[PDB]
């Protein structure tokens, strides 16, 4: 038979789902960033845990260790590129200091809100899922899209979007036709 | 008087002009491209 295709889980249930403080923090995060369910928060927590565990393991090694240098440089480069880690904080120690909110900040929904295209984070999500937002020359319909530093400046309304210079949507031309009749 | 012959006549006339204005003719043809 054909060789296997690998698959993996991108989230894991927390050690204690029932902590009141954890519930309150999840509520705050979901409301602030307009997240649909707890699965998104669990996913981002899983990723951040993976990066921080890797940072711990690399820190454990002796300094100048070639594996330490190479892997730490790669991880810091990736974190700086994705925008979570600032330019001046290129040390594994500051990688270990990251928080979930930083990753939630880079989400395309939050960025679309911040740049002024939407009046609410929920409005940003609706715009994204309705094919109105384009990164560069490309339409993206995924709120969880993680925006890079280079790509943040190219977020705009899509050319095909009615808000981006295309023809009016079905409702607009329908009403215009009815008024004309 | 096929179209190819017409280009020749212009080309031959063009070469005659290049000779009249004038190695030099060779270099100028390179300058054309």
């Amino acid at each position: 038979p054909r060789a296997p295709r690998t698959y993996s889980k991108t989230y894991s249930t927390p050690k204690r789902p029932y902590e009141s403080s954890r519930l309150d923090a999840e509520l705050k995060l979901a409301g602030e960033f307009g997240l649909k369910n707890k699965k998104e928060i669990y996913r981002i927590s899983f990723q951040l845990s993976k990066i921080r565990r890797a940072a711990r393991d690399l820190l454990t090694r002796d300094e100048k260790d070639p594996k330490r240098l190479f892997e730490g440089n790669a991880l810091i480069r990736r974190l700086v590129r994705v925008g979570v880690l600032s330019e001046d904080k290129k040390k594994l120690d500051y990688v270990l200091a990251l928080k979930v909110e930083d990753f939630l900040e880079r989400r395309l929904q939050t960025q679309v809100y911040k740049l002024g295209l939407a009046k609410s984070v929920h409005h940003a999500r609706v715009l994204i899922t309705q094919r109105h937002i384009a990164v560069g020359k490309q339409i993206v319909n995924i709120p969880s899209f993680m925006v890079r530093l280079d790509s943040e400046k190219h977020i705009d309304f899509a050319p095909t979007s009615p808000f981006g210079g295309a023809r009016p949507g079905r409702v607009a031309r329908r009403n215009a036709a009815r008024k004309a009749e | 008087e096929n179209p190819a012959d017409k280009r020749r006549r212009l080309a031959k006339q063009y070469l005659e002009n290049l000779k009249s204005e004038a190695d030099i003719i060779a270099s100028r043809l390179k300058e054309d491209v």
């Binding site: 094919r131 384009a134 020359k137 490309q138 339409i139 899509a158 050319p159 095909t160 | -």
Partner: protein, 130 residues
């Protein structure tokens, strides 16, 4: 308007053709038929339409551009000689061969395997017996 760009162009004398990746930018249009691209590629590369083959067109997410793989043979005879039969049928250069469904052909093969020889003698024998 529609713009066709050819990239990663390789010249294969072994198959006597030219391989490339065709990228078609088609703003404000759903996409471009294979026939129109065949015509345009034939015009650009100065060949017969019959000598141009195109396939693998997948409009990216969000529309506006298509990417696929394109072939330009040196002359039509080579195109007929090397091109797959199915792609020739798509272009009308060749006619689809009509054949029974696989199950019928396999059953006929088995029934013929059952008989030995031409079978005329068996026919005469059964005719005489009954």
């Amino acid at each position: 308007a529609v713009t066709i760009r050819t990239r990663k162009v390789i010249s294969n004398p072994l198959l006597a053709r030219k391989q490339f990746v065709v990228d078609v930018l088609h703003p404000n249009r759903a996409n471009v038929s294979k026939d129109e691209l065949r015509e345009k590629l034939a015009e650009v590369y100065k060949a017969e339409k019959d000598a141009v083959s195109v396939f693998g067109f997948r409009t990216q997410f969000g529309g506006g551009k298509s990417v696929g793989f394109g072939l330009v043979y040196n002359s039509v005879a080579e195109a007929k000689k090397f091109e797959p039969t199915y792609r020739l049928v798509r272009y009308g250069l060749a006619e689809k061969v009509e054949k029974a469904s696989r199950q019928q052909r396999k059953q006929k093969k088995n029934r013929d395997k059952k008989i030995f020889g031409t079978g005329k003698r068996l026919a005469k024998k059964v005719a005489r017996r009954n």
